[PDB]
Write an enzyme that holds these catalytic residues in place. Structure first.
Site, mmCIF file in Angstrom:
data_model
loop_
_atom_site.group_PDB
_atom_site.id
_atom_site.type_symbol
_atom_site.label_atom_id
_atom_site.label_comp_id
_atom_site.label_asym_id
_atom_site.label_seq_id
_atom_site.Cartn_x
_atom_site.Cartn_y
_atom_site.Cartn_z
ATOM 1 N N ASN A 113 0.842 -1.173 0.000
ATOM 2 C CA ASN A 113 0.000 0.000 0.000
ATOM 3 C C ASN A 113 0.878 1.222 0.000
ATOM 4 N N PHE A 114 0.237 2.349 -0.225
ATOM 5 C CA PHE A 114 0.916 3.624 -0.124
ATOM 6 C C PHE A 114 2.172 3.731 -1.046
ATOM 7 N N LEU A 115 2.068 3.143 -2.213
ATOM 8 C CA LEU A 115 3.003 3.433 -3.288
ATOM 9 C C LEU A 115 2.710 4.832 -3.718
ATOM 10 N N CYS A 116 3.735 5.677 -3.696
ATOM 11 C CA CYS A 116 3.558 7.081 -3.995
ATOM 12 C C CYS A 116 4.884 7.730 -4.504
ATOM 13 N N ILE A 117 4.810 8.362 -5.687
ATOM 14 C CA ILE A 117 5.914 9.227 -6.212
ATOM 15 C C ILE A 117 5.443 10.677 -6.293
ATOM 16 N N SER A 123 6.796 9.456 -14.235
ATOM 17 C CA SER A 123 7.149 9.072 -15.600
ATOM 18 C C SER A 123 8.645 8.935 -15.819
ATOM 19 N N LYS A 124 9.370 8.584 -14.752
ATOM 20 C CA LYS A 124 10.793 8.273 -14.778
ATOM 21 C C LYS A 124 11.066 6.792 -14.464
ATOM 22 N N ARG A 125 10.044 5.965 -14.503
ATOM 23 C CA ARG A 125 10.194 4.518 -14.272
ATOM 24 C C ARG A 125 10.778 4.189 -12.876
ATOM 25 N N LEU A 126 10.454 5.035 -11.892
ATOM 26 C CA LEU A 126 10.855 4.768 -10.506
ATOM 27 C C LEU A 126 9.964 3.659 -9.874
ATOM 28 N N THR A 127 8.702 3.546 -10.308
ATOM 29 C CA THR A 127 7.828 2.430 -9.794
ATOM 30 C C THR A 127 8.411 1.021 -9.752
ATOM 31 N N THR A 149 -4.222 -4.036 -4.133
ATOM 32 C CA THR A 149 -5.245 -3.465 -5.002
ATOM 33 C C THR A 149 -4.731 -2.130 -5.568
ATOM 34 N N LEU A 392 -6.981 -1.209 2.872
ATOM 35 C CA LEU A 392 -7.230 0.179 3.241
ATOM 36 C C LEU A 392 -6.785 1.239 2.216
HETATM 37 C C1 LIG Z 1 7.001 -10.847 -2.165
HETATM 38 C C2 LIG Z 1 6.740 -9.389 -1.967
HETATM 39 C C3 LIG Z 1 6.424 -8.541 -3.212
HETATM 40 C C4 LIG Z 1 5.818 -7.185 -2.902
HETATM 41 C C5 LIG Z 1 5.564 -6.467 -4.210
HETATM 42 C C6 LIG Z 1 4.203 -6.823 -4.776
HETATM 43 C C7 LIG Z 1 3.923 -5.844 -5.935
HETATM 44 C C8 LIG Z 1 3.361 -4.517 -5.473
HETATM 45 C C9 LIG Z 1 3.032 -3.577 -6.650
HETATM 46 C C10 LIG Z 1 2.459 -2.242 -6.334
HETATM 47 C C11 LIG Z 1 1.255 -2.115 -5.410
HETATM 48 C C12 LIG Z 1 0.772 -0.678 -5.262
HETATM 49 C C13 LIG Z 1 -0.484 -0.554 -4.452
HETATM 50 C C14 LIG Z 1 -0.902 0.833 -4.247
HETATM 51 O O1 LIG Z 1 -0.386 1.443 -3.398
HETATM 52 S S1 LIG Z 1 -2.067 1.421 -5.331
HETATM 53 C C15 LIG Z 1 -1.933 3.190 -5.208
HETATM 54 C C16 LIG Z 1 -0.852 3.801 -6.052
HETATM 55 N N1 LIG Z 1 -0.644 5.219 -5.824
HETATM 56 C C17 LIG Z 1 -1.226 6.189 -6.502
HETATM 57 O O2 LIG Z 1 -2.038 5.999 -7.391
HETATM 58 C C18 LIG Z 1 -0.810 7.566 -6.078
HETATM 59 C C19 LIG Z 1 -0.665 8.515 -7.269
HETATM 60 N N2 LIG Z 1 0.290 8.038 -8.233
HETATM 61 C C20 LIG Z 1 1.619 7.970 -8.043
HETATM 62 O O3 LIG Z 1 2.147 8.323 -7.009
HETATM 63 C C21 LIG Z 1 2.376 7.431 -9.232
HETATM 64 O O4 LIG Z 1 1.603 7.680 -10.460
HETATM 65 C C22 LIG Z 1 2.699 5.948 -9.190
HETATM 66 C C23 LIG Z 1 3.734 5.733 -8.088
HETATM 67 C C24 LIG Z 1 1.403 5.092 -8.954
HETATM 68 C C25 LIG Z 1 3.294 5.476 -10.564
HETATM 69 O O5 LIG Z 1 4.474 6.253 -10.870
HETATM 70 P P1 LIG Z 1 4.590 6.866 -12.357
HETATM 71 O O6 LIG Z 1 3.224 7.213 -12.773
HETATM 72 O O7 LIG Z 1 5.598 7.963 -12.275
HETATM 73 O O8 LIG Z 1 5.155 5.619 -13.121
HETATM 74 P P2 LIG Z 1 6.644 5.137 -13.356
HETATM 75 O O9 LIG Z 1 7.051 5.816 -14.614
HETATM 76 O O10 LIG Z 1 7.442 5.222 -12.116
HETATM 77 O O11 LIG Z 1 6.465 3.605 -13.688
HETATM 78 C C26 LIG Z 1 5.439 3.169 -14.582
HETATM 79 C C27 LIG Z 1 5.192 1.695 -14.322
HETATM 80 O O12 LIG Z 1 4.593 1.494 -13.018
HETATM 81 C C28 LIG Z 1 3.458 0.676 -13.186
HETATM 82 N N3 LIG Z 1 2.399 1.081 -12.264
HETATM 83 C C29 LIG Z 1 1.768 2.277 -12.304
HETATM 84 N N4 LIG Z 1 0.874 2.313 -11.297
HETATM 85 C C30 LIG Z 1 0.982 1.195 -10.617
HETATM 86 C C31 LIG Z 1 0.300 0.684 -9.529
HETATM 87 N N5 LIG Z 1 -0.672 1.419 -8.912
HETATM 88 N N6 LIG Z 1 0.632 -0.517 -9.094
HETATM 89 C C32 LIG Z 1 1.619 -1.257 -9.671
HETATM 90 N N7 LIG Z 1 2.264 -0.782 -10.748
HETATM 91 C C33 LIG Z 1 1.951 0.417 -11.228
HETATM 92 C C34 LIG Z 1 3.027 1.125 -14.604
HETATM 93 O O13 LIG Z 1 2.106 0.268 -15.143
HETATM 94 C C35 LIG Z 1 4.274 1.147 -15.389
HETATM 95 O O14 LIG Z 1 4.595 -0.186 -15.638
HETATM 96 P P3 LIG Z 1 5.172 -0.681 -17.065
HETATM 97 O O15 LIG Z 1 4.678 0.419 -18.153
HETATM 98 O O16 LIG Z 1 6.732 -0.908 -16.898
HETATM 99 O O17 LIG Z 1 4.517 -2.180 -17.136
HETATM 100 C C1 LIG Z 2 -13.898 10.757 -3.560
HETATM 101 C C2 LIG Z 2 -12.529 10.447 -4.160
HETATM 102 N N1 LIG Z 2 -11.472 10.744 -3.358
HETATM 103 C C3 LIG Z 2 -10.216 10.604 -3.801
HETATM 104 C C4 LIG Z 2 -10.025 10.003 -5.044
HETATM 105 C C5 LIG Z 2 -11.082 9.615 -5.846
HETATM 106 C C6 LIG Z 2 -12.391 9.830 -5.437
HETATM 107 C C7 LIG Z 2 -13.513 9.340 -6.264
HETATM 108 O O1 LIG Z 2 -14.025 7.771 -6.143
HETATM 109 C C8 LIG Z 2 -12.911 6.907 -6.155
HETATM 110 C C9 LIG Z 2 -12.527 6.241 -4.988
HETATM 111 CL CL1 LIG Z 2 -13.427 6.503 -3.535
HETATM 112 C C10 LIG Z 2 -11.374 5.405 -4.918
HETATM 113 C C11 LIG Z 2 -10.598 5.211 -6.062
HETATM 114 C C12 LIG Z 2 -9.424 4.400 -6.046
HETATM 115 C C13 LIG Z 2 -9.180 3.546 -7.102
HETATM 116 C C14 LIG Z 2 -8.071 2.697 -7.027
HETATM 117 N N2 LIG Z 2 -7.177 2.709 -6.000
HETATM 118 C C15 LIG Z 2 -7.408 3.480 -4.976
HETATM 119 N N3 LIG Z 2 -6.528 3.450 -3.922
HETATM 120 C C16 LIG Z 2 -5.578 2.418 -3.678
HETATM 121 C C17 LIG Z 2 -6.164 1.367 -2.687
HETATM 122 N N4 LIG Z 2 -6.636 2.044 -1.521
HETATM 123 C C18 LIG Z 2 -7.745 2.987 -1.883
HETATM 124 C C19 LIG Z 2 -7.054 4.133 -2.674
HETATM 125 C C20 LIG Z 2 -8.539 4.330 -5.005
HETATM 126 C C21 LIG Z 2 -11.005 5.852 -7.233
HETATM 127 C C22 LIG Z 2 -12.165 6.678 -7.273
HETATM 128 CL CL2 LIG Z 2 -12.586 7.410 -8.820
#
Ligand SMILES: CCCCCCCCCCCCCC(=O)SCCNC(=O)CCNC(=O)[C@H](O)C(C)(C)COP(=O)(O)OP(=O)(O)OC[C@H]1O[C@@H](n2cnc3c(N)ncnc32)[C@H](O)[C@@H]1OP(=O)(O)O
Ligand SMILES: Cc1ncccc1COc1c(Cl)cc(-c2ccnc(N3CCNCC3)c2)cc1Cl
Length: 392
Positions: A113-117, A123-127, A149, A392
């Site tokens: 959880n809480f993956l965040c850049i 868009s620098k492939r830090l994920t 999720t 969560l």
């Molecule tokens: C054994 C233990 C293992 C544990 C590990 C299990 C795996 C856990 C995996 C993660 C569980 C996370 C659970 C949560 O917390 S889900 C919530 C994620 N956070 C957010 O949405 C917050 C807002 N966004 C950001 O902070 C950034 O846009 C993030 C960090 C999401 C991407 O940064 P950016 O936008 O600058 O991208 P990039 O250029 O670095 O890299 C692009 C690559 O990253 C792949 N990508 C993008 N989004 C996700 C995503 N949500 N899950 C997995 N992968 C993701 C993407 O397809 C592309 O892949 P590819 O084009 O190479 O295929």
């Molecule tokens: C009300 C609202 N608050 C912040 C963001 C988005 C919204 C609007 O409804 C949602 C809600 Cl409630 C949640 C999500 C969403 C989708 C995929 N992942 C997540 N997160 C990652 C897993 N924990 C929940 C946060 C949230 C996406 C939308 Cl569009």
């Protein structure tokens, strides 16, 4: 169904991979309040938004304390990246341990959880780099599988569930652009539609107490066994995840309520919800949507497998949860299509959401599980039984 590969413990690297110039790895100690503040600073401005950049998740510091320092937690799984010169926290990825049941195989996993850049470093492939490093840290600690999720489609999803939203303060929601005014209607008419009773109806309903842990643990475990994918709760996990400690937590994040049968005094049902605000990114008169999210619940009525009786019982219990949440000043009550929620969502006036949650397993293969929706992405009672874990 089973693991995809065996990890060779002898070959797990002791050193992390290289980072973007200017940045370095840092374990977070969320017992240090300045570090908890740092994480909060980063998520508050850079975490999950809708597609219209109207709303952003606003986890509290209390919520983060609660979500991340759960039973069996390790600081090693709270991963930060910092700027080398300024020391600023610019990215995160976190895990906590739990056990899950995947079609009656029990598995030890990390929930990620809480993956965040930081927006400036997108868009620098830090994920993949973040993902590889937490994977390494988990491998070193004997954990080889994960669950997570996301709201984006990635390879091989296990299930997919839709978000639903029951207005509690419709006018607040309308004013921040969360709820629309349909169309042929008025403010007065939406408020009327959303009106709830002032008192709850289920007899013996009261807040959960610490004395309730063993019975709620038992009933929850039985209930959750009815889903292909579910969280395999320990007693410590019931205490952590369900029982608010007002002594030690100033800003309450979890609420749980039990039904003590008036005749037998056994707990026959429970439900729970948590406090998760979103920031209203740019609105004149409000600045936050105060959401309660339905979390875990259970009812003895489930085990009759009378689906008729189950719906009726859940209509009453869930309407009570709405009333309790309104009473606690929440604007909206949010739930997904998982558990048995398709039995009550539409009738209790939850509106269908834009958001979707996709579920994934790392290093574990299993057939897809139904996520409470049909092909139109509408709730379906013949598509439940699949997802019994709420992350969560
Ligand atoms: C054994 C233990 C293992 C544990 C590990 C299990 C795996 C856990 C995996 C993660 C569980 C996370 C659970 C949560 O917390 S889900 C919530 C994620 N956070 C957010 O949405 C917050 C807002 N966004 C950001 O902070 C950034 O846009 C993030 C960090 C999401 C991407 O940064 P950016 O936008 O600058 O991208 P990039 O250029 O670095 O890299 C692009 C690559 O990253 C792949 N990508 C993008 N989004 C996700 C995503 N949500 N899950 C997995 N992968 C993701 C993407 O397809 C592309 O892949 P590819 O084009 O190479 O295929
Ligand atoms: C009300 C609202 N608050 C912040 C963001 C988005 C919204 C609007 O409804 C949602 C809600 Cl409630 C949640 C999500 C969403 C989708 C995929 N992942 C997540 N997160 C990652 C897993 N924990 C929940 C946060 C949230 C996406 C939308 Cl569009």
């Amino acid at each position: 169904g089973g693991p995809i590969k065996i990890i060779d413990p002898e070959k797990v690297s002791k050193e992390p991979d290289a980072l973007l110039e200017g940045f370095e790895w840092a374990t977070l100690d969320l017992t240090n309040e300045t570090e908890l503040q740092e994480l909060w600073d980063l998520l508050t401005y850079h975490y999950v938004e809708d597609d219209n950049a109207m709303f952003r998740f606003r986890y509290s510091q209390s919520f983060l304390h609660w979500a991340l320092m759960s039973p069996g937690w390790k600081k090693e799984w709270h991963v930060g990246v910092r700027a080398t010169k300024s020391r600023k926290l610019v990215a995160s990825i976190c895990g906590v341990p739990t056990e899950i049941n995947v079609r009656n195989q029990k598995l030890k996993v990390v929930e990620i959880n809480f993956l965040c850049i930081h927006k400036k470093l997108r868009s620098k492939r830090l994920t993949p780099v973040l993902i590889k490093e937490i994977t390494r840290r988990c491998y070193l600690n004997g954990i080889y599988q994960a669950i997570y999720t996301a709201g984006v489609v990635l390879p091989t999803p296990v299930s997919s569930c839709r978000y639903y939203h029951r207005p509690l303060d419709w006018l607040k929601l309308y004013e921040v652009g969360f709820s629309p005014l349909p169309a042929g209607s008025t403010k007065a008419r939406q408020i009327t539609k959303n009106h709830l009773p002032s008192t709850t109806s289920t007899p013996g309903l009261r807040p959960m107490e610490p004395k309730d842990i063993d019975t709620v643990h038992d009933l929850l475990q039985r209930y959750l066994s009815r889903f292909a994918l579910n969280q395999a709760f320990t007693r410590e996990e019931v205490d952590h995840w369900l029982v608010h400690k007002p002594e030690t937590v100033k800003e309450q994040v979890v609420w749980a309520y039990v039904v003590e049968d008036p005749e037998t005094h056994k707990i026959t049902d429970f439900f729970s919800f948590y406090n998760l605000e979103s920031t209203v990114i740019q609105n004149p008169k409000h600045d936050n949507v105060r959401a309660a999210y339905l979390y875990y619940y259970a009812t003895e009525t489930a085990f009759t497998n009378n689906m008729k009786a189950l719906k009726e019982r859940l209509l009453m219990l869930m309407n009570d949860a709405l009333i309790l949440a309104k009473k606690a000043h929440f604007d909206v009550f949010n739930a997904l299509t998982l558990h048995d929620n398709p039995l009550f969502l539409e009738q209790l006036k939850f509106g269908a959401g834009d958001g979707q949650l996709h579920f994934y397993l790392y290093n574990y293969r299993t057939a897809p599980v139904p996520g409470g929706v049909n092909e139109k992405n509408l709730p379906d009672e013949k598509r439940m039984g699949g997802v019994g874990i709420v992350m969560l």
